[PDB]
Design an enzyme around this catalytic site. Structure first.
Site, PDB file in Angstrom:
ATOM      1  N   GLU A  35      45.053  32.994  41.131  1.00 42.55           N
ATOM      2  CA  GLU A  35      43.732  33.645  41.554  1.00 42.55           C
ATOM      3  C   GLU A  35      42.819  32.668  42.205  1.00 42.55           C
ATOM      4  OE1 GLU A  35      43.268  36.733  41.781  1.00 42.55           O
ATOM      5  OE2 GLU A  35      44.521  37.783  40.085  1.00 42.55           O
ATOM      6  N   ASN A  46      36.621  42.135  49.814  1.00 40.00           N
ATOM      7  CA  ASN A  46      37.542  43.163  49.955  1.00 40.00           C
ATOM      8  C   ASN A  46      37.021  43.982  51.003  1.00 40.00           C
ATOM      9  OD1 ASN A  46      39.726  42.214  48.062  1.00 40.00           O
ATOM     10  ND2 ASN A  46      38.199  42.599  46.691  1.00 40.00           N
ATOM     11  N   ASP A  49      37.357  48.207  50.505  1.00 46.87           N
ATOM     12  CA  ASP A  49      36.644  49.134  49.515  1.00 46.87           C
ATOM     13  C   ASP A  49      35.114  48.433  49.195  1.00 46.87           C
ATOM     14  OD1 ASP A  49      37.304  47.017  47.684  1.00 46.87           O
ATOM     15  OD2 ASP A  49      37.188  48.651  46.046  1.00 46.87           O
ATOM     16  N   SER A  51      34.209  45.763  47.762  1.00 48.00           N
ATOM     17  CA  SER A  51      34.078  44.935  46.453  1.00 48.00           C
ATOM     18  C   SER A  51      34.430  43.580  46.897  1.00 48.00           C
ATOM     19  CB  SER A  51      35.025  45.559  45.306  1.00 48.00           C
ATOM     20  OG  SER A  51      36.416  45.041  45.999  1.00 48.00           O
ATOM     21  N   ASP A  53      35.846  39.679  44.812  1.00 46.01           N
ATOM     22  CA  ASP A  53      36.455  39.027  43.603  1.00 46.01           C
ATOM     23  C   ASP A  53      35.531  37.774  43.315  1.00 46.01           C
ATOM     24  OD1 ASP A  53      38.406  41.152  43.526  1.00 46.01           O
ATOM     25  OD2 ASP A  53      39.441  39.902  45.053  1.00 46.01           O
ATOM     26  N   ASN A  60      36.807  41.432  39.896  1.00 50.01           N
ATOM     27  CA  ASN A  60      36.231  42.436  40.928  1.00 50.01           C
ATOM     28  C   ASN A  60      35.124  43.141  40.335  1.00 50.01           C
ATOM     29  OD1 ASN A  60      36.491  45.390  42.260  1.00 50.01           O
ATOM     30  ND2 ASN A  60      37.241  43.892  43.513  1.00 50.01           N
TER      31      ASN A  60
END
Length: 130
Positions: A35, A46, A49, A51, A53, A60
């Site tokens: 990750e 991102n 959408d 959002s 991380d 998220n």
């Protein structure tokens, strides 16, 4: 902070992650490795959408933490996303535990499915004294 492998294994074990909800420490190590490369300040926007991380587990903002700029998002961990960017990983661990208390468990992270699921992950904890 960028953790070294075994340093992180013991840190996670001290935080109660070994076998949490049936998830071995080696699985959490494989998750963190893929990750963020064990990097607590890692972030990924991102564009699709809106959002982002956050942290070592790349949690998220749409459902887990609040950053105030993700449309119609929730904050199931009841934490500011800033808390997931600290050198101290206690909050990212508290939130990662919250994530897995849901039906999907460790499968919540697609990266876990791609790089850890049904794989030999023993190598992540070998020599760490855990």
């Amino acid at each position: 902070k960028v953790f070294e492998r075994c340093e992180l294994a013991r840190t996670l074990k001290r935080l109660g992650m070994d076998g949490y909800r049936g998830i071995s420490l080696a699985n959490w190590m494989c998750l963190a490795k893929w990750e963020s490369g064990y990097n607590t300040r890692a972030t990924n926007y991102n564009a699709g959408d809106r959002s982002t991380d956050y942290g070592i587990f790349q949690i998220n903002s749409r459902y887990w933490c609040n950053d105030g700029k993700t449309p119609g998002a929730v904050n199931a961990c009841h934490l500011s996303c800033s808390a997931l960017l600290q050198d101290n990983i206690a909050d990212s661990v508290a939130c990662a535990k919250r994530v897995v208390r849901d039906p999907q468990g460790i499968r919540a992270w697609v990266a876990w499915r791609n790089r850890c699921q049904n794989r030999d992950v023993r190598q992540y904890v070998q020599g760490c004294g855990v």
